[PDB]
Design a protein around this ligand. Structure first.
Ligand SMILES: C[C@H]1O[C@@H](n2cnc3c(N)ncnc32)[C@H](O)[C@@H]1O
Ligand SMILES: N[C@@H](Cc1ccc(O)cc1)C(=O)O
Ligand code: MET
Ligand code: SF4
Ligand SMILES: [Br-]
Ligand SMILES: [Br-]
Ligand SMILES: [Br-]
Ligand SMILES: [Br-]
Ligand SMILES: [Br-]
Ligand SMILES: [K+]
Length: 366
C-alpha cells in the first residue's frame, strides 16, 4: 500500500490515446469545475489546453490568492557537503566528477547560518550529497541543532532515509522534507541513475510516505523536468502529490517544477521543456490542488520568476548558492548553475512592487 502501487497501475496507461480524445469542450468544462480529478489535471496538461492558458492563469491566480493571500514565502538553500557515491548523470556532484569535495565544519555552518539569518530569512533548506561516511545522519543532526538557533523552519533535501531516521531528524528539529523523484518512468530512472544507492527507484519513491508516516509537517516533491516526457512527468508529480495529500490529510504537500540547468559534467537534457510548458504545468497543478504550495527556485531567470509571481507560485528562493561554502568562495563549483542571482532583499523589493508581501514564516501566507 504505497505510491508504487499507483506507478504499477499506470504502467499500461496510454497517454497518447488519452490526449487524442481531449477536445476544447473538455478544457472549458474543467475550468468551470471546483474539484478536478487526476485525469482532469492530465487534460489541463494537454496540447489542446495551450489554447486556454489565459483562462487558466486567471483562475489559478484567484485560487492562489484565496488560499495564500498576496504573499510569497522566501527561503534559501544551504549546501552542507558535496561528497557523493551516486553516479546521477545530470548532477554536478556525481561521483565521477572532479571537484573539491567539501563538508562544512560546524563553525562554518554556524557562520553561514548567521550570514543567511542576517538577511531576515527564517526558513532554510539544507542539502548534502549521498555519503554516509562524510555526511551521516549524525552530522546532519548536529547541523540542525545549530540552525534551530536562527531559523524557525528547517527542511532537509538529503539522501532518502528510513522512517526511523526521518523521526530522529524530526525529533532534532526538522520541519519539512523536499525530495524530487527525478523521473517517474522506471526504465528512464534506471538509465539516469547507473550507480549507487540512488539506483533503488522504489526506496526513493516511497521516501515522502516514510517521512509523512514519521510525522513530517510539510513535504515538497517534484520530477526533474528534462529527464523524460514532460507532460507525463508533470502528471505523475501531481498524481503523487494528490496521493500524499489523501494518505496524509494534515500534511502540507507542495511541488516544485525544477528544470535542468548547466552543470559540471555536461550531460544535456534528455528532453526539452519550454517556458510555456513550465507555465502550463504550474497553472494546471494549481487548478488541480488549489491549497498546495508551488516552489520556484533560482533555476529560472529573474524575468520569468517575476512573471510567475501571480501565476500560482507560493514559495521562492533568493540569495541562493549551490556550492558548498560558495557564499564566501565565488570559485566553488555548484551542483548546477543558477540563473536568478538576485539577493533576498532584491527579490523582496520586487515582490512589494508587484503588490505582494514577502513573508518569512509560512504561517503568514493566508
Ligand atoms: C537537489 C535537486 O537538484 C536537482 N538537480 C540535480 N542536478 C541538476 C541540474 N543539472 N540542474 C538542475 N537541477 C538539478 C535534482 O532534482 C536534485 O534532487
Ligand atoms: N536544488 C534544490 C535546492 C535549491 C533551492 C532553491 C534554489 O534557488 C537553488 C537550490 C531545490 O530546488 O530544492
Ligand atoms: C544534493 S541532491 C539532493 C540530495 C540527495 N543527494 C538526493 O539526490 O536526493
Ligand atoms: S543528485 Fe544528489 S545523489 Fe545524485 S549525484 Fe547529485 S548529490 Fe549525489
Ligand atoms: Br470541443
Ligand atoms: Br552512502
Ligand atoms: Br488542494
Ligand atoms: Br556553478
Ligand atoms: Br542574499
Ligand atoms: K572552523
Amino acid at each position: 500500500g504505497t505510491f508504487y502501487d499507483v506507478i504499477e497501475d499506470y504502467r499500461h496507461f496510454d497517454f497518447a490515446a488519452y490526449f487524442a480524445k481531449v477536445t476544447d469542450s473538455d478544457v472549458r468544462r474543467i475550468l468551470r469545475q471546483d474539484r478536478l480529478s487526476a485525469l482532469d489535471f492530465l487534460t489541463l496538461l494537454s496540447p489542446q489546453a495551450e489554447a486556454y492558458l489565459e483562462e487558466m492563469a486567471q483562475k489559478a491566480h484567484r485560487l492562489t490568492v484565496q488560499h495564500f493571500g498576496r504573499t510569497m514565502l522566501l527561503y534559501t538553500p544551504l549546501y552542507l557537503a558535496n561528497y557523493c557515491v551516486n553516479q546521477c548523470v545530470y548532477c554536478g556532484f556525481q561521483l565521477k566528477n572532479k571537484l573539491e569535495r567539501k563538508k562544512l565544519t560546524l563553525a562554518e555552518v554556524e557562520q553561514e547560518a548567521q550570514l543567511i539569518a542576517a538577511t531576515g530569512l527564517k526558513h532554510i533548506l539544507i542539502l548534502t550529497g549521498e555519503s554516509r561516511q562524510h555526511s551521516p545522519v549524525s552530522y546532519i543532526k548536529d547541523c540542525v541543532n545549530i540552525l534551530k538557533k536562527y531559523f524557525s523552519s528547517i527542511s532537509i533535501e538529503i539522501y532518502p532515509l528510513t522512517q526511523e531516521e526521518y523521526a530522529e531528524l524530526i525529533g532534532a528539529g526538522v520541519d519539512g522534507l523536499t525530495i524530487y523523484q527525478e523521473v517517474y518512468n522506471e526504465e528512464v530512472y534506471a538509465e539516469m541513475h547507473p550507480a549507487g544507492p540512488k539506483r533503488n527507484y522504489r526506496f526513493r519513491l516511497e521516501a515522502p510516505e516514510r517521512a509523512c508516516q514519521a510525522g513530517m509537517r510539510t513535504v515538497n516533491i517534484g520530477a526533474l523536468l528534462g529527464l523524460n516526457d514532460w507532460r507525463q512527468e508533470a502528471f505523475f508529480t501531481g498524481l503523487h502529490a494528490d496521493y500524499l495529500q489523501r494518505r496524509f490529510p494534515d500534511v502540507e504537500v507542495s511541488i516544485s517544477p525544477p528544470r535542468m540547468r548547466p552543470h559540471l559534467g555536461g550531460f544535456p537534457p534528455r528532453v526539452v521543456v519550454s517556458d510555456q510548458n513550465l507555465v502550463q504545468y504550474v497553472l494546471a497543478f494549481r487548478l488541480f490542488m488549489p491549497r498546495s504550495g508551488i516552489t520556484l527556485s533560482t533555476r529560472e531567470n529573474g524575468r520569468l520568476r517575476d512573471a510567475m509571481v501571480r501565476l500560482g507560485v507560493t514559495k521562492m528562493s533568493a540569495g541562493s548558492c549551490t556550492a558548498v561554502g560558495g557564499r564566501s568562495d565565488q570559485e566553488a563549483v555548484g551542483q548546477f548553475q543558477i540563473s536568478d542571482e538576485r539577493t533576498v532583499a532584491e527579490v523582496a523589493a520586487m515582490l512589494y512592487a508587484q503588490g505582494y508581501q514577502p513573508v518569512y514564516k509560512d504561517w503568514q501566507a493566508l
